[PDB]
Curated annotation (Swiss-Prot), chain D:
It comes from Saccharomyces cerevisiae (strain ATCC 204508 / S288c) (Baker's yeast). SMART domains: Proteasome_A_N. It comes from the Eukaryota. The 26S proteasome consists of a 20S proteasome core and two 19S regulatory subunits. The 20S proteasome core is composed of 28 subunits that are arranged in four stacked rings, resulting in a barrel-shaped structure. The two end rings are each formed by seven alpha subunits, and the two central rings are each formed by seven beta subunits. The catalytic chamber with the active sites is on the inside of the barrel. GO terms for cellular component: cytosol; nucleus; proteasome complex; proteasome core complex, alpha-subunit complex; proteasome storage granule. There is a cross-link at K99, K198, K230 (Glycyl lysine isopeptide (Lys-Gly) (interchain with G-Cter in ubiquitin)). This is Proteasome subunit alpha type-3. PANTHER family: PROTEASOME SUBUNIT ALPHA/BETA (PTHR11599). The proteasome degrades poly-ubiquitinated proteins in the cytoplasm and in the nucleus. It is essential for the regulated turnover of proteins and for the removal of misfolded proteins. The proteasome is a multicatalytic proteinase complex that is characterized by its ability to cleave peptides with Arg, Phe, Tyr, Leu, and Glu adjacent to the leaving group at neutral or slightly basic pH. It has an ATP-dependent proteolytic activity. Keywords: Cytoplasm, Isopeptide bond, Nucleus, Proteasome, Ubl conjugation.
From Swiss-Prot, chain F:
The 26S proteasome consists of a 20S proteasome core and two 19S regulatory subunits. The 20S proteasome core is composed of 28 subunits that are arranged in four stacked rings, resulting in a barrel-shaped structure. The two end rings are each formed by seven alpha subunits, and the two central rings are each formed by seven beta subunits. The catalytic chamber with the active sites is on the inside of the barrel. This is Probable proteasome subunit alpha type-7. Keywords: Acetylation, Cytoplasm, Nucleus, Proteasome. It comes from Saccharomyces cerevisiae (strain ATCC 204508 / S288c). The proteasome degrades poly-ubiquitinated proteins in the cytoplasm and in the nucleus. It is essential for the regulated turnover of proteins and for the removal of misfolded proteins. The proteasome is a multicatalytic proteinase complex that is characterized by its ability to cleave peptides with Arg, Phe, Tyr, Leu, and Glu adjacent to the leaving group at neutral or slightly basic pH. It has an ATP-dependent proteolytic activity. One of its GO terms (biological process) is proteasomal ubiquitin-independent protein catabolic process.
Curated annotation (Swiss-Prot), chain G:
PROSITE patterns: PROTEASOME_ALPHA_1, PROTEASOME_ALPHA_2. The keyword Iron does not apply. It holds the Pfam family Proteasome_A_N. There is a cross-link at K222 (Glycyl lysine isopeptide (Lys-Gly) (interchain with G-Cter in ubiquitin)). Keywords: Acetylation, Cytoplasm, Isopeptide bond, Nucleus, Phosphoprotein, Proteasome, Ubl conjugation. It comes from Saccharomyces cerevisiae (strain ATCC 204508 / S288c). Belongs to the peptidase T1A family. GO terms for cellular component: mitochondrion; nucleus; proteasome complex; proteasome core complex, alpha-subunit complex. GO terms for biological process: proteasomal ubiquitin-independent protein catabolic process; proteasome-mediated ubiquitin-dependent protein catabolic process. This is Proteasome subunit alpha type-1. The 26S proteasome consists of a 20S proteasome core and two 19S regulatory subunits. The 20S proteasome core is composed of 28 subunits that are arranged in four stacked rings, resulting in a barrel-shaped structure. The two end rings are each formed by seven alpha subunits, and the two central rings are each formed by seven beta subunits. The catalytic chamber with the active sites is on the inside of the barrel. Interacts with CIC1.
UniProtKB/Swiss-Prot annotation, chain H:
It comes from Saccharomyces cerevisiae (strain ATCC 204508 / S288c) (Baker's yeast). The gene is RPT2. Belongs to the AAA ATPase family. The 26S proteasome is involved in the ATP-dependent degradation of ubiquitinated proteins. The regulatory (or ATPase) complex confers ATP dependency and substrate specificity to the 26S complex. Has ATPase activity. Coiled coil: none annotated. This is 26S proteasome regulatory subunit 4 homolog.
Amino acid sequence: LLRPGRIDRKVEFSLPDLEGRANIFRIHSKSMSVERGIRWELISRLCPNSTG
Amino acid sequence: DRGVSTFSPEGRLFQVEYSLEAIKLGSTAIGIATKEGVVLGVEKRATSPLLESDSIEKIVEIDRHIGCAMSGLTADARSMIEHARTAAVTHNLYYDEDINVESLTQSVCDLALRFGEGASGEERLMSRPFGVALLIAGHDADDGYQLFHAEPSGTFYRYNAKAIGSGSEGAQAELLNEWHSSLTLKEAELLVLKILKQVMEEKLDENNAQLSCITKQDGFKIYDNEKTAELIKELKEKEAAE
Amino acid sequence: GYDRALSIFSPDGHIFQVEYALEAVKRGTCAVGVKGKNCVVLGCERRSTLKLQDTRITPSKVSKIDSHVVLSFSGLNADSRILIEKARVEAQSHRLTLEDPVTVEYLTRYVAGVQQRYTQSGGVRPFGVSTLIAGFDPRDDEPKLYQTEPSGIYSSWSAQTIGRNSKTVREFLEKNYDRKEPPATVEECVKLTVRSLLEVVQTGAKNIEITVVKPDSDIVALSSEEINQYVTQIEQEKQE
Amino acid sequence: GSRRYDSRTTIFSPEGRLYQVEYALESISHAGTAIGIMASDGIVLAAERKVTSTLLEQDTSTEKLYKLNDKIAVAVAGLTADAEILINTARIHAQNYLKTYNEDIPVEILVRRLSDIKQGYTQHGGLRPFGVSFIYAGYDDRYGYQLYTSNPSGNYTGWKAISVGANTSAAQTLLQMDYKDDMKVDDAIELALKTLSKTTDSSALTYDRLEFATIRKGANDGEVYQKIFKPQEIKDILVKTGIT
Amino acid sequence: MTDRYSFSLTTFSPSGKLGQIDYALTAVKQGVTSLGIKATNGVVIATEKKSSSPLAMSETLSKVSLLTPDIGAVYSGMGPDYRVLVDKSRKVAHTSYKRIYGEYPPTKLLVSEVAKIMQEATQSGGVRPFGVSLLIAGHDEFNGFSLYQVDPSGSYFPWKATAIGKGSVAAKTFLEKRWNDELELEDAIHIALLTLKESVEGEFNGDTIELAIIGDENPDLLGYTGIPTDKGPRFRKLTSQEINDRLEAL
Amino acid sequence: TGYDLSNSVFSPDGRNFQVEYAVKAVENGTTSIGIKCNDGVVFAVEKLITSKLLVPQKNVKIQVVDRHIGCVYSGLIPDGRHLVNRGREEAASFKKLYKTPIPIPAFADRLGQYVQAHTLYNSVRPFGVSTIFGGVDKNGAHLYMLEPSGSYWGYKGAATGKGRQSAKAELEKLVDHHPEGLSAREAVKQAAKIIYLAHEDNKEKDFELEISWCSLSETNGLHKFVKGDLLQEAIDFAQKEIN
Amino acid sequence: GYDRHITIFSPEGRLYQVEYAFKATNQTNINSLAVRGKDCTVVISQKKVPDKLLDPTTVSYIFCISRTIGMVVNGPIPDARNAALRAKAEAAEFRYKYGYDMPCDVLAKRMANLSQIYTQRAYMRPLGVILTFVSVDEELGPSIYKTDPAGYYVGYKATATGPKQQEITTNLENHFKKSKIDHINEESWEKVVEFAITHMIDALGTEFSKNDLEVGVATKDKFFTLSAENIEERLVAIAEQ
Amino acid sequence: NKIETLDPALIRPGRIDRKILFENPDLSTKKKILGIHTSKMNLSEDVNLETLVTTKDDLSGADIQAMCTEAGLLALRERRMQVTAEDFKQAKERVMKNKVEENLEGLYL
Amino acid sequence: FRNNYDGDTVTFSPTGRLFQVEYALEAIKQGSVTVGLRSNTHAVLVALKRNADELSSYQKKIIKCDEHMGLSLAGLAPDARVLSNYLRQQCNYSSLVFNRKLAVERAGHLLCDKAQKNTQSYGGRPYGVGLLIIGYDKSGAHLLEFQPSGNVTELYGTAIGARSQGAKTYLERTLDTFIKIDGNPDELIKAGVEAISQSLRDESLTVDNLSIAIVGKDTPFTIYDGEAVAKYI
């Protein structure tokens, strides 16, 4: 299957940088009521690289 | 073993790649330099009310007109600071002259560089370049006020504004816009504290922030408690309009 | 002899050795310091359980480094012996060259520089040893209580716990001492140190040493009858 | 060739307990038993030989109890080769201190320095550490009799009774029940020989598999006298106690 | 240019007891047979010394070597290790010995010096242990005749009788019975040759069998009889004829 | 398996396998020839012109030792330069002691010890180069080759590099046809021929011919490069021969 | 595993480096024969047929150690040069200190000590050559000593080295035991040469020519090779006979 | 015991949400657990609840189960007709002794 | 990849390659691009100064050894600092004793010996840096290319760093043009401006980033930047 023809693109998805993981945290957090003024980037900073 | 000798596939030194992560854990330090004064403001780490916050230091005098901030492995950075102190005194003897911040920056990188592998032109007694980065600031006529950021790489860059430690990435993003040529000492001071609360996990206090400056008038001078408090108090009044 | 690299940084930006060193400290049996504004009070557990061990000639953890500088530890018992000798020579080297006994502040940096040299050299493993350093600065009566890490970092602390089960002991010091005003007298302060140690020791009066060091090189040791006196008070609190 | 290969014994262990030192205690317990019993008026010191071969002239050759000087005798358990180097080092150290200060070295000082050498080996020596425990039976006027033992770790601990070598627990347990604080040297002689026989698998522990020494201040005109007891003198006191 | 080793290759086995000490010992056992009987008026040391190739000179091959004119020694194990260890032992004894005493070393003393050197080989990184066992047979005033056995472990003990090499087990037992408290010099040699025949049978020419005694004193051998109160060489290396003679009186 | 890896440990056949690895570089390197002639020795080396960025006559591998020994080498280029330095060190030291030029036999003997020394070290790698060296001295013309493994012999003719196969097959027939040898002058033309047969092998890039010589009669037992009219005729005439 | 690979004592106690070294000699395929004359020591050896690249007259096996000692080396060609240094250098050493050159027995003792040392360090390995020192000592008269990579050594009445040493031994065994002579009792050294060549041709089965030869004769206070003219003159007598 | 005994695969993390790490009983915990056990042993009421806690070495509630069993085991050997204050106290020493014996002395250096 | 041999410097693969050198060639391409060209009477270096970010100031890449000699760094930056201090001392010594300036050929040769030495034995990294050494001496203008391996080679133009092929394309066409230009600084510099625009793809010059230096017959070592380089553009 790996041989060419069959598979024309191969792409590695990896755990993103701090700015993207701020964005993934951002979407979920918005949906919930929170005390506003929240620094999304603060919460992501502490977390090492991590899954969605 | 993975020595200093043996490189990564790209060709980088191992220790240079690892040291980036070491610094990241370190204490956040924020430097904005202007031609009206270098302002160094740092986060003091605290784990207890029982820790005594007077004793600890993260801004360290290296010379009469030289201030420094340290991040990385602290215990390795304590030696680094002792030798830097030696270098400065030794120059002062030879030329009867206050070392340029820039030369001092180079003299320190030459001393981190020296391993343990076993050379044939050099003295070995370490194992690696230190995996600590330092912000070396100071004043001299030629360049005016300066702020340097030394890497474990054996590379020095001069900066207008540089943030290292935990908050490296988010502080830098603001510092590009907000830093200007127009800024003076009172301007600079307020800005540093503002960035510092966003990247500080807990609240901002005058008892977990330590400010200093290098001015040419005073040399290296650590601000008392009272000034620090007052600039915090002044920043509050503006935040409550919102 | 050995000189090959062991200061090889992890890819998680740490010396491996330094991690292992931290692990070791814990195991050493607890030592506690709480300074008053008129004393430093030192408590520690010693081995004395074993019938047919003569305590007079079994070495005591608490160590004279100078008449007014004392040192206690948690960690490798082998490596401490080396440590204590190093401090003793330095202490005397100050009186020889700069004159006057070590300032406490100066001995704290000396002790720290030994650990640091072990991390600069790849050859030499850091000691797995933390120490409590306490004393009176020259010409002065101010109590200093210092703390070390085996990694080569030092700091001053109002109260401290190192060694076995720091958790229970830490939680007690956060409620029983407050930083705004230190214990007023020697007697009030001895009682708190005693109360804290018995938490993880469980009773005894024979096994535990309490050593009070007061200004002007006064080191005096509490009799077992005096230790129990404090226990007798505390039994009444626990009952009510 | 030499770069590739490693036999580093100078790794800081992750358990806080260096693995090489662990194995040297195993090796100690293969070697015969040596017992230090401290009494107010002396140290009664006795160690069984571990050879038992008949062709071998055990009689002549002391191999465990070595007299360093007048007040200090050492019993060996562990590796006999490693041990020889430390005997010469311990002998020269007591002489040098005696020369400088004109006082027999306090016991404390001597034991500490020797322990610190063992320590040094794993500190950054690169050396495998000596796999020997020594009971240093010592006297000095100030502190009375003093009894200390060493470890391959380079740690010493004082005691009023100690055992090393084989049957550490079996010997220690008997001494705890039978020895009382106040028993004198006189009792301890009788006590030592009998507990050893009972630990060992031998039906009677012969005089020729024994080494016996005492350090006592009950030698007249305020003096200190040691005597490594000769194999036949061990035999008479062996008969009294009924082992034979 | 020194090997980049900086540490002891020798490690404790995880069950105790050095790997390398065990490794060195096997060689002594594998190597050819030697026996010795300590006696009251001498010491007999005996070894097999088979032709390497008939064309090879079988006279220049030696396994007896001198340490002092009074003390001789024989080994089993690695041949090249022995030669060097002897040379070191001449210096360790003689010079240093003369400076602190100015005599020939007594046997007890000489044997102890050798023990430390074996230990230092092993301990030292980059240098693997000497795997040879030597029997040092000698005379001193204060202990009469003495026989010590020196193990490659750096340990020594004196023995009434001992054997090392392949045939050691058989030999020791044979001897054990024959050994007496009072022994004739003549009988010690008869008994020695009798056992040696059983180690490997045939080749009993006194050429291929190397025999020495630490016999009685000679101002004759000394080469000055002008004062004959001086001790002569105690050590004597026997001729082939002498051995031939012993076979008839056995 | 493991004996191979460990530098300076007997392979189970015999002799460290790294010494064999080093030989392989020398084959991959450029042609170098050394010809013993009546008068003296004639060296030629193939200098590839990869590009015209390269400076004509100026990427010489020809390095004088003392003043009467040419040295030229094939294989790993840095390794040569270290062994080249070593020859220099050795020549001077002889003149300290004995106040006169080193003989060529003595040079061949003393250079060879240096290779062996590093290859009974595990810590210091093999040399990756065969060196052709020689000159004319008081004791006459002499030609030696130091193999990568360290062996010195007299040679009528010597060759190393990729095109030694071509070089060898000619030199055997040239000696068969001329057992009385040939003058160094004629051999300037004949060196040029030999190199042309070897550039069949190294046909990928163009080349530049460089001869040097040390001759008894004509360079007066000093070593100097061949250039101008001597070199030109050698090019011109050889060309015709090989067509 | 590991123990075996590098120098250190294997579990068995075997030194694998040494075993391999003995194979190494045979790989050069050189064969030697040495006999004892009455007053000379004749050693003769093969040399592989010359290349047109090489010079056929060059030799590199023979090395004049001192006036007394000549040496012929069988084994690795590169290591033979290495070994040749140490023999001459220690030969000269003895002249300064003790005032004269080493005997044959005494030079062997010294090389053997050196060999042993080379084996213990990792970095150092035993010289893979087998060395054949020839001499006429005064005290021992005609002498041959064979010194091994191990550091092992012993004198010989007559010796052989190489893959086909097996054939030579059997010939010399026949030669010297039946007669019952420890060495050749023929006085003229020329007839010892005549005769050692004769035994070589017989034993390996292949005739020798000037080019394979190479004749070493050591005498009292001299080591010499025979001139090429003389090599050819011995051939005329050998064929008639 | 752990999720590392299983091949890990527990799907949807937030679908298994919070995970609970059991610490072992501490000093205060084992008072209460003790109180149940001592009510079964006849006449052990005499020995104050608190002082029972103090005199023993810090141990888990499981080891109280071992100790309570030890009291009855000793009462059976003695043919102690009714469980006493003396049994409960004796019980502490033998139970603590078992646990130390079972441990292997590897020597803290 | 790791594999092969590179923790061990001595040991090589069957082919004979040492992996350490391969990595060191890659290292060049990661860092600064610099181009050189020379006429018979002048020697030119054109270096693109670079930084980490905007607030960072730009940082020299030509480090002046002497009034008569220079070098430019492109692979490892700590390595270059070492060699330059070293080379400063060697020019002093040679000028002091022999009264003769350290000529560019020897200087590359002394330098090879130092790098080679660290790679010969255990201990010591290969110097990964590629240096382009210019110098003006009695025998006119030289440009040498210091390989990480320890090989020097005389060239007339060369380009180093990633995508160096573009620059070389230009220089070979105008090889003849460039050499026959002599006595002209302006002319030379103008060509070298164009050489480096071939290399750069999806990347911008800036005049302050562009740093150009000459050394020649009438000119000592001089560095020109800003308004100065605006002239040659």
